[PDB]
Design a binder for this molecule. Structure first.
Ligand SMILES: [Cs+]
Ligand SMILES: [Cs+]
Ligand SMILES: [Cs+]
Length: 138
């Protein structure tokens, strides 16, 4: 039903996971740094997310820096294969539900693809209010 490609060390990923749970479902959790998607799966995720390959790339990580990926010298498939070989390059979290797939940056993007409403108010771990008790986005 719901899958999250999760990094426990990222607040955005933690907040997204807690919003999923606050809709009343426990997702399948894939620790993508250890169990990355296959090439076919990553291609499908990107298609369904509706963003460019480069938009999925995480900047400010060692392979991005050392491979010079900031420069516009790479095709989409070159970037995909770097993501598969260096999964820390895949930005996070990616969430799949029956409604669609999103790169949930910022975390509250996940509200778009959660079928069931938040079960009560939601406040991010840093105290940023997201939905009030009535269900309204702030
Ligand atoms: Cs896999
Ligand atoms: Cs929704
Ligand atoms: Cs933050």
């Amino acid at each position: 039903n719901i899958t999250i490609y999760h990094n426990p060390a990222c607040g955005t990923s933690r907040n997204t996971l807690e919003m999923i749970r606050n809709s009343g479902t426990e997702p399948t959790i894939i620790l993508y740094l250890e169990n990355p998607p296959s090439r076919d799966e990553l291609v499908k995720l990107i298609a369904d997310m509706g963003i460019s390959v480069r938009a999925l790339l995480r900047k400010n990580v060692e392979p991005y820096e050392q491979l010079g990926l900031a420069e516009d010298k790479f095709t989409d498939d070159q970037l995909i294969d770097f993501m598969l070989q260096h999964p820390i390059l895949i930005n996070r979290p990616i969430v799949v539900t029956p409604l669609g797939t999103r790169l949930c940056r910022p975390s509250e993007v996940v509200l778009d693809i959660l079928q069931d409403a938040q079960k009560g108010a939601f406040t991010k771990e840093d105290g940023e209010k997201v939905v009030d008790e009535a269900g309204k986005r702030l």
